[PDB]
Amino acid sequence: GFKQDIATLRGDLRTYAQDIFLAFLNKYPDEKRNFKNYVGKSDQELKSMAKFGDHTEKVFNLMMEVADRATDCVPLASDASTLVQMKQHSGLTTGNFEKLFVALVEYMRASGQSFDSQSWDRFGKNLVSALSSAGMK
Ligand code: HEM
């Protein structure tokens, strides 16, 4: 289930974080307008850049924490607040997060692996809700 999925992802987090993030950027190309530095680069080019590997792992490090602290796929309000009030997210709307989680769910559904994709879908929607509550547009 969800909890084990957290453990699975953590067991190879750099690889999962990059593959999921790339799935997100490839599905929603318009989203690269939040990451100018990634434009015009193939997946392999991105994976070899320093800031890509570093930023994305750090994203998933915290995502997994937020996931881990959730109850029944409902994140802590404190965690939602943190994500909203991060300077690096000044721009974002919940739509950005929505898309990330659609790609994440899609990735999991197409993997050979018995991820609990329905729980990640709930998690994504509940985080979006919590981010709305904590003040993100
Ligand atoms: C649960 C979801 C997410 C978590 C946990 C998260 C977490 C983080 C963290 C920890 C950083 C700092 C990384 C660093 O600079 O070392 C970061 C930076 C950033 N996040 Fe998020 N993030 C999430 C979703 C998103 C989404 C959906 C977007 C845009 C669609 C986004 C855009 C950014 C940008 C633009 C930066 C910094 C600039 C860059 O390095 O590209 N984040 N995020």
How far, in Å, is the centroid of ligand 1 from the Cα of 3?
22
Residue 94 Cβ inside 6 Å of ligand 1? The answer reads no
Residue 102 Cβ inside 6 Å of ligand 1? The answer reads no
How far, in Å, is the centroid of ligand 1 from the Cα of 21?
10
CA dihedral 15, 18, 24, 28 (to 10 degrees): -140
Question: How far is the C-alpha of 108 from the C-alpha of 124, rounded, in Å?
Answer: 13
CA dihedral 74, 80, 83, 85 (to 10 degrees): 180
How far, in Å, is the centroid of ligand 1 from the Cα of 64?
13
DSSP assignments along 49-68, one per residue: SHHHHHHHHHHHHHHHHHHH
Residue holding tokens 């739509």? Answer: 95
> Could you tell me the CATH number of the domain that includes residue 106?
1.10.490.10
Residue holding tokens 């602290």? Answer: 69
Asked if residues 12 and 133 have their Cβ atoms less than 8 Å apart, the reply is no
Asked if residues 47 and 18 have their Cβ atoms less than 8 Å apart, the reply is yes
Question: How far is the C-alpha of 26 from the C-alpha of 43, rounded, in Å?
Answer: 9
**Residue 89 annotated as lining a ligand binding site:** yes
Identify the residue whose C-alpha is closest to ligand 1 atom 30.
Answer: 96
Q: Dig out the tokens for 124 from the structure.
A: 């994504």
Q: How many domains would you assign to the chain?
A: 1
Residue 132 Cβ inside 6 Å of ligand 1? The answer reads no
Identify the residue whose C-alpha is closest to ligand 1 atom 19.
Answer: 88
At how many Å resolution was this determined?
2.0
Mark out the alpha helices in the chain (DSSP H runs).
Answer: 2-10, 13-27, 43-48, 50-69, 77-84, 94-110, 117-133
Q: What is residue 111's DSSP assignment?
A: S
Q: Which range of residues forms the domain containing residue 96?
A: 1-137
Length of the chain: 137
